[PDB]
Amino acid sequence: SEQLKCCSGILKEMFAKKHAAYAWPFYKPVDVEALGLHDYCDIIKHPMDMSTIKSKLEAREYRDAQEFGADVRLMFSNCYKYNPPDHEVVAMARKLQDVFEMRFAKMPD
Numbered sequence: 354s355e356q357l358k359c360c361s362g363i364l365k366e367m368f369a370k371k372h373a374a375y376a377w378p379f380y381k382p383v384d385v386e387a388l389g390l391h392d393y394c395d396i397i398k399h400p401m402d403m404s405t406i407k408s409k410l411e412a413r414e415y416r417d418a419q420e421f422g423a424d425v426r427l428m429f430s431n432c433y434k435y436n437p438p439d440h441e442v443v444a445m446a447r448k449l450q451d452v453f454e455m456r457f458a459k460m461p462d
């Protein structure tokens with residue numbers, strides 16, 4: 354339970370305006386329709402976003418902290434898989450990932 358509460362803090366920071374500069378692209382779920390990505394569903398089968406992860410935490414969907422990280426990492430994996438390695442969005446993803454990996458690890462046991 355205590356560990357689960359920490360997840361909310363880490364995710365909350367990612368939404369802050371401190372990382373919003375390179376974490377805004379991970380705020381809402383990728384709209385294959387709005388964005389016009391007619392090849393996102395074929396590549397990405399299990400999509401995920403920060404907004405979704407936040408809702409799951411509110412509904413106590415996650416059992417442990419480990420599960421919470423699985424979704425966070427999956428969100429970045431889909432980006433690295435869909436978009437190319439020389440893509441700007443990729444550079445921003447690595448920045449947010451580092452902030453999550455550090456906080457997630459620095460989390461009190």
Ligand SMILES: CCNC(=O)C[C@@H]1N=C(c2ccc(Cl)cc2)c2cc(OC)ccc2-n2c(C)nnc21
Nearest residue numbers: 378379382383384388389390431432435436441442
């Ligand atoms: C760029 C090729 N086609 C795309 O739409 C890829 C898409 N690319 C973008 C994107 C990123 C930066 C710019 Cl300048 C233009 C488009 C994107 C834009 C979004 O705004 C609604 C949300 C998620 C995105 N995203 C993420 C996250 N990973 N790949 C993409």
